[PDB]
Design an enzyme around this catalytic site. Structure first.
Site, PDB file in Angstrom:
ATOM      1  N   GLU A 214      42.050  55.811  47.533  1.00  0.00           N
ATOM      2  CA  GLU A 214      41.151  56.930  47.717  1.00  0.00           C
ATOM      3  C   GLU A 214      41.724  58.181  47.059  1.00  0.00           C
ATOM      4  OE1 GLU A 214      40.135  57.559  51.824  1.00  0.00           O
ATOM      5  OE2 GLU A 214      39.359  59.578  51.433  1.00  0.00           O
ATOM      6  N   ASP A 216      40.813  62.068  47.016  1.00  0.00           N
ATOM      7  CA  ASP A 216      39.987  63.106  47.632  1.00  0.00           C
ATOM      8  C   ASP A 216      39.966  64.330  46.737  1.00  0.00           C
ATOM      9  OD1 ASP A 216      39.464  61.489  49.878  1.00  0.00           O
ATOM     10  OD2 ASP A 216      41.268  62.226  50.899  1.00  0.00           O
ATOM     11  N   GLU A 219      37.837  67.883  50.423  1.00  0.00           N
ATOM     12  CA  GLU A 219      37.661  67.793  51.869  1.00  0.00           C
ATOM     13  C   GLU A 219      37.580  69.246  52.309  1.00  0.00           C
ATOM     14  OE1 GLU A 219      37.738  64.797  53.668  1.00  0.00           O
ATOM     15  OE2 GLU A 219      38.155  63.586  51.874  1.00  0.00           O
ATOM     16  N   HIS A 230      45.580  59.197  47.897  1.00  0.00           N
ATOM     17  CA  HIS A 230      45.902  58.119  48.832  1.00  0.00           C
ATOM     18  C   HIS A 230      46.029  56.769  48.087  1.00  0.00           C
ATOM     19  CE1 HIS A 230      44.534  60.376  52.547  1.00  0.00           C
ATOM     20  NE2 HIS A 230      43.674  60.905  51.701  1.00  0.00           N
TER      21      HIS A 230
END
Length: 442
Positions: A214, A216, A219, A230
């Site tokens: 992942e 990001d 956020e 991640h």
């Protein structure tokens, strides 16, 4: 999942731009599909719900295999996008309403390619990804997120023949949290040992989780924002059980296949509290729209190099705004994600560097090289009330201890039952998406 026959699936058209040089872009006629969790699940040859509220029907779904045989997910027609799910498009802008009143709470969606049969896969190494965002109506406890995950382009259809819908029905979701709340995993209902989540009338957790890498990009709400890598070992979609999921509840957060914390650059947490916030004297004013630019730098400046750096800058009302910097005594003033930044900041914060354990920026890059699916979502947080993003985490921690304070929100904020009333009309907008070589999108 089988596909139901009650309603045609009609994704929302969303054009993006693919660019070769600054102001030289061409339209790519993509579309937005709703995640399969939000779909009506009913009997294959009828109208009877297989899932209602936060429970599977035990007669129809005594086992996952029987559930999968008996049940099907159905389409989202155009009228239902706004009326039921709170999704709409105007030109190149996509809007997601948090609560839509029969009452829908949050949404997760994916970008389809121009055929509308596969996710638009982005090979992000040595590229720049850019979009315009409005999070002015999102306050403490809410998150309007834009991110990439290592889903399969067909949602797993080729791997799992019981998955009849594929990307067309928003199937195959996985992320670095290895979530058990995904209703369909590896082509099967995740109905074994299904447990409702208390205080969440729509959601539960099944036996399996679904893991994958992942990235990001965003956020955020109007109070705090973060970008985070991640990696997982491996990066690709992996159904998990037991310790491999790295479940929080069994003390396994750091024992699983994915880096759950990720390596984050969050301006406020990095000790610049004046960079981003809801007002004109913050450097970046979250009460107004702005452009978010992300550059994925490799070791040799080519598509074949290892991922080495996630750079970030912003544009607001024509004003270029460089990223904030890490601001602690004796720590280098990093303004990007690198392996060194991750080691130094996690060292300071006393956070376990699971990012490094999972192969670091290089491993994150391998996911990005294979291609990742774009996710756009709006959600509240039934586990941790979004305190990790926008408050003190842990809530009992001293806010002067580096790493604890992530935003100005009170530690009592973000209770889903409260935010679902108080912020019912919150809407995140993502628009004017642009993708191309480094330096090409503004």
């Amino acid at each position: 999942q089988n596909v139901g026959t009650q309603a045609a699936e009609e994704p929302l058209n969303l054009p993006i731009s693919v660019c070769t040089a600054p102001g030289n872009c061409q339209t790519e006629a993509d579309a937005v599909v709703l995640d399969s969790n939000w779909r009506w699940a009913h009997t294959t040859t009828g109208y009877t719900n297989c899932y209602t509220g936060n429970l599977w029907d035990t007669t129809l779904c005594p086992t996952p295999e029987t559930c999968t045989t008996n049940c099907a997910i159905d389409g989202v027609p155009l009228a239902d996008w706004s009326g039921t799910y709170g999704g709409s498009v105007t030109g190149n802008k996509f809007n997601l309403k948090f609560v839509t009143v029969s009452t829908n709470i949050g949404a997760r969606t994916f970008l389809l390619d121009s055929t509308k049969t596969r996710y638009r896969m982005f090979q992000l190494l040595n590229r720049e990804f850019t979009y315009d965002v409005d999070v002015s109506s999102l306050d403490c406890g809410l998150n309007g997120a834009l991110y990439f995950v290592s889903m399969d382009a067909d949602g797993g259809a080729a791997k799992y023949p019981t998955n009849k819908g594929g990307a067309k029905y928003g199937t195959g979701y996985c992320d670095a949290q290895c979530p058990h709340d995904v209703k369909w995993i590896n082509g099967l209902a995740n109905s074994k040992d299904w447990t409702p989540i208390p205080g969440d009338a729509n959601s539960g957790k099944g036996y399996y989780g679904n893991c994958c890498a992942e990235l990001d990009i965003w956020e955020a709400n109007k109070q705090s924002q973060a970008f985070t890598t991640h990696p997982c070992t491996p990066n690709d979609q992996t159904r998990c059980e037991g310790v491999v999921c790295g479940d929080n509840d069994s003390g396994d957060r750091y024992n699983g296949m994915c880096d759950k914390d990720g390596c984050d650059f969050a301006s406020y947490r990095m000790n610049d509290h004046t960079f981003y916030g809801p007002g004109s004297t913050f450097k970046l004013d979250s009460t107004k729209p702005f452009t978010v630019v992300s550059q994925f730098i490799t070791t040799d400046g080519t598509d074949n190099g290892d991922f080495k750096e996630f750079r970030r800058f912003y544009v607001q009302n024509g004003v270029r705004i460089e990223n904030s910097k890490v601001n602690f005594p004796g720590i280098t003033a990093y303004d990007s994600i690198t392996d060194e930044m991750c080691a130094a900041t996690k060292g300071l914060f006393g956070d376990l560097d699971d990012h490094k354990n999972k192969g670091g920026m290089k491993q994150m890059g391998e996911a990005m090289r294979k291609g990742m699916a774009l996710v756009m979502s709006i959600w509240d947080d039934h586990d941790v009330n979004m305190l990790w993003l926008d408050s003190n985490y842990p809530p009992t921690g001293n806010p002067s201890t580096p790493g604890v304070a992530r935003g100005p929100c009170p530690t009592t904020s973000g209770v889903p039952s409260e935010v679902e009333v108080t912020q019912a009309n919150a809407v995140v907008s993502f628009g004017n998406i642009k993708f191309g070589p480094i330096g090409s999108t503004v």
